[PDB]
Amino acid sequence: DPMYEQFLQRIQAVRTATVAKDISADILEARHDYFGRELCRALDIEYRNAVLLDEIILDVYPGVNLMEYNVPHVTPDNYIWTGDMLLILDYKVSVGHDSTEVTYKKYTTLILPVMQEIGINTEICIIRANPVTNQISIVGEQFKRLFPTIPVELNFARFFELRKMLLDKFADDE
Ligand SMILES: [Mn+2]
């Protein structure tokens, strides 16, 4: 894939910490996205790369009077509308829980209040893949019920080797 080739080329070329950090960030984003794409495929849901909350409201209630509400402009990775419930979806790729809790608290306090005012039943769902062991952990009782089985086959090895190469190249930096 040119994904890896593009990244191998920037890593080979990079000479300073500050540009390497932007490469590091872009590796983790691509790792996140590859997870989200393989998830949405296995679950047959429309893959999206962030959706503005305002877009989400307007899809589930097109007669919304957007201007009459204070809608925080958060862009979660995706969403599912069941016709009766809204599930806000965030994909994580991580060995730890830290970012799952940060995002869970952020989306709970920023999304749910306006959806409660508008009258949309709403659940914050977060799906996390461990890059090392491939195991999937799910926040979202409604998400679990609607997707008890997740038929993804993942492989994060390219991403690990790119970031291992990047951080070997800058072992004695900061
Ligand atoms: Mn995410």
Q: What is the DSSP string of 105-162?
A: HHHHHHTHHHHHHHT--EEEEEEEE-TTT--EEEE-HHHHHH-S--------HHHHHH
What is the 8-class DSSP label of residue 93?
A: E
Q: How far is the CA of 172 from the centre of ligand 1 (A)?
A: 30
Chain-centroid distance, C-alpha 24: 17
Q: How far is the CA of 90 from the centre of ligand 1 (A)?
A: 4
Nearest to 89 by CA among 133, 134, 128, 145: 128
Beta bridge partners of 83: none
- Indicate which technique resolved this structure: X-ray
Beta strands across the sheet bearing 136-139: 78-81, 86-93, 122-129, 136-139
Q: How far is the CA of 124 from the centre of ligand 1 (A)?
A: 12
Q: What is the largest CA-CA distance in the chain?
A: 57
Other residues' Cβ atoms within 10 Å of the Cβ of residue 163: 19
Q: Is residue 80 a contact partner of residue 90, using CB atoms and an 8 Å limit?
A: no
Give the resolution value in Å.
2.3
Q: How far is the CA of 34 from the centre of ligand 1 (A)?
A: 11
What is the C-alpha separation between 28 and 24, in angstroms, rounded? 6
Please list, in sequence order, all residues whose beta carbon lies within 8 angstroms of the beta carbon of residue 173, skipping any fewer than 6 positions away.
Answer: 17, 20
The one-letter amino acid code at 162 reads: L
> How many independent structural domains does the chain possess?
1
Domain containing 16: what range?
1-174
- Ramachandran bin of 155, using left for φ above 0, alpha for ψ from -120 to 50, beta for the remaining angles: beta
What is the 8-class DSSP label of residue 67?
A: G
